[PDB]
Amino acid sequence: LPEQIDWRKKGAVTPVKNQGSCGSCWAFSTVSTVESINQIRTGNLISLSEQELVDCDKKNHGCLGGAFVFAYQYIINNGGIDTQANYPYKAVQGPCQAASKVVSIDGYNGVPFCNEXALKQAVAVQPSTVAIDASSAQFQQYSSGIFSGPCGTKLNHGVTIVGYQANYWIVRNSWGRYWGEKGYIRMLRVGGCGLCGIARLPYYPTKA
């Protein structure tokens, strides 16, 4: 496995997005991994619709939260997801619209829990979604550098790992460009269940 990898440098990651005052991080994180696996498999980088999930993924709760599994499942059962351009983000749940199926995935896989070595292996193949405890003030006001806590392991926020170095994970948040390092945060690799519990619940989409 590479000692380091950054999917942003390989053309598999779209510009940073902003979920606004809507608790749809479960949608932004999940969709991000689908945008990435599609580019890795087809060579085409396309920005997809988070709003579609917020409005139509009924098993989840729009701006009130949701789970990764149900998001990936919706995409699969629905036969695909539309683009950001065709179904723009409003930061508020609204009536589910009919949509075109531009990008599709075949399934999703979970990574063994609290095993950063296995997580490293998954990330080396493609960006993966993970849940973390983002309740600490230090995480919320993070600006730059390698974040090393403090933070607990109570899962309450979804983000995406788009790369790593020997000492840290490169994490893509969905709070816009003005948070952290242009929308990203470098989190220290500490083993166990990971910093802020980042290694507790990882998943990634699959596409033949």
**Residues labelled as active-site residues:** 25, 157, 173
**Does the annotation flag 25 for ligand binding?**
yes
Q: Are 130 and 170 in contact (CB under 8 A)?
A: no
Q: How far apart are CA 111 and CA 38, in angstroms?
A: 20
Q: How far apart are CA 114 and CA 89, in angstroms?
A: 33
- Positive/negative CA dihedral, 112, 72, 32, 198: negative
What are the structure tokens assigned to 176, written together? 């816009």
What are the structure tokens assigned to 19, written together? 């979920």
How wide is the angle at C-alpha 137 spanned by C-alphas 135 and 140, nearest 5°?
75
Q: How far apart are CA 42 and CA 36, in angstroms?
A: 10
Q: How far apart are CA 142 and CA 175, in angstroms?
A: 12
Q: How far apart are CA 184 and CA 175, in angstroms?
A: 9
Residues forming a β-bridge with 187: 147, 169
* List of residues 6+ apart from 137 with CB closer than 8 A: none
Residue numbers in the known binding site for E64 are: 25
Residue numbers in the known binding site are: 25
